[PDB]
Amino acid sequence: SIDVKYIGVKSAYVSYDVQKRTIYLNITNTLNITNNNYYSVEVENITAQVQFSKTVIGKARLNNITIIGPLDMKQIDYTVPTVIAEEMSYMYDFCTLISIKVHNIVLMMQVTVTTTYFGHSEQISQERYQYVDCG
């Protein structure tokens, strides 16, 4: 990437910005902008690009062959008892959460067993997280 911007409130290339309780009297503004941009990005100049996978087996014996790729999740056990007993009680549960395996952004890319690749790979991830707001 080239220009990545994080701004919380206001992005302004030109801002004549005035707030309340201002007296804005006798202003003469003269403004000139000359903006010229060159973007020349991701230029590839190749005479030849060659890729292959060659596998050759001859007079061979294969047994007990196991191949397992990434992200192998096995024998997962979640046990979350919640045993709440009461005896003439006043329960006041205002802002309470019970979260198990909560995901916001999951990006899986180029997850294989055998891979051949030429080129550009780019991830851009922007957000404002706010899990709990309780008043």
Ligand X SMILES: *[C@@H]1O[C@H](CO)[C@@H](O)[C@H](O)[C@H]1NC(C)=O
Nearest alpha carbon to residue 124 among 103, 109, 135, 114: 109
Looking at the Cβ atoms of 39 and 92, the one nearer to ligand X is: 39
According to CB under 8 A, which residues from 71 to 110 bind its own copies? Answer: 71-110
Which tokens sit at 12? 């302004």
Residue 4 contact, options ligand X, its own copies, none, Cβ 5-8 Å cut-off depending on partner type: its own copies
Nearest alpha carbon to residue 100 among 81, 71, 78: 78
According to CB under 6 A, which residues from 7 to 36 bind ligand X? Answer: 25-26, 30, 32, 34
Q: How far is the CB of 72 from ligand X (least distance, A)?
A: 14
According to CB under 6 A, which residues from 33 to 62 bind ligand X? Answer: 34, 43, 45
Residues 76 and 115: beta-carbon distance below 8 Å: no
Which DSSP letter does residue 19 get?
-
According to CB under 6 A, which residues from 61 to 80 bind ligand X? Answer: 64
Binding residues vs ligand X (CB under 6 A): 25-26, 30, 32, 34, 43, 45, 64
